[PDB]
């Protein structure tokens, strides 16, 4: 780290390596300010810069620790709307970050444990700060984060359909129908619960879906 200096001597050197993007040297600086002044004049905005430095340096629990620090430090702040965005933004990075993106592989057949967390914080942003500069951003994420659950819930509804566990087809597909009407994974799962019924001899109950198939054909 950097020893006990003036707070801005640590900070302006930290402010360089954020502008330089040298987060591993910025985190070498930014903690060294809060090593000596965690109450200091920058230490409130160090944490925001730390969530800026850590998450850019893939220190994602450390960013989220710096969030929960700043949650415990400043339960309100002019940059909690930053932080409540930054919670879900790290949580989106917490969810799906594999190298298979350049090879063209879906990662919403993969566990959205942290997109679920990102669904919370982005919605806690657009509720708790419904007009911030991050609110307009995180609102559209949430609809796609709904779709990220949708393709994930389609991935298992795919699985049970080819499994032919038509009870488990129904309960998964009804879960999609509890969750969202809007994605195409709604209307593509729509005949599959209808498929489950004819396979479970609930043809008349499949006709009730066939009405919805008729009504939500368009």
């Amino acid at each position: 780290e950097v020893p006990d200096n003036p707070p801005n001597e640590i900070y302006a050197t930290a402010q360089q390596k954020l502008q330089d993007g040298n987060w591993r040297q910025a985190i070498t600086q930014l903690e060294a300010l809060d090593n000596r002044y965690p109450f200091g004049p920058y230490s409130q905005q160090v944490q925001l810069d730390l969530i800026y430095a850590y998450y850019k340096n893939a220190d994602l629990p450390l960013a989220q620790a710096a969030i929960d620090r700043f949650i415990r430090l400043n339960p309100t702040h002019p940059n909690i709307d930053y932080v409540m965005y930054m919670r879900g933004l790290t949580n989106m990075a917490l969810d799906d970050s594999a190298l298979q993106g350049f090879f063209g592989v879906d990662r919403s057949d993969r566990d959205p444990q942290h997109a679920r967390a990102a669904f919370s914080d982005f919605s806690k942003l657009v509720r708790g700060y419904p007009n911030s500069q991050y609110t307009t951003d995180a609102t559209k994420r949430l609809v796609f984060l709904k779709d990220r659950l949708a393709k994930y819930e389609y991935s298992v509804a795919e699985y049970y359909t080819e499994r032919g566990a038509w009870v488990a087809v129904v309960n998964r597909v009804e879960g999609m129908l509890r969750d969202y009407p809007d994605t195409q994974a709604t209307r593509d799962a729509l005949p599959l619960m209808e498929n489950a019924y004819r396979q479970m001899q609930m043809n008349a109950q499949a006709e009730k879906v066939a009405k919805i198939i008729a009504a939500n054909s368009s």
Partner: peptide, 21 residues
């Protein structure tokens, strides 16, 4: 199923004998 954040879950989900429903 938890811990399928990089693997295809249905490949893991088909490796079970206890069934839903």
């Amino acid at each position: 199923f938890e811990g399928n954040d990089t693997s295809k879950d249905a490949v893991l989900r088909r490796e079970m004998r206890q069934m839903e429903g």
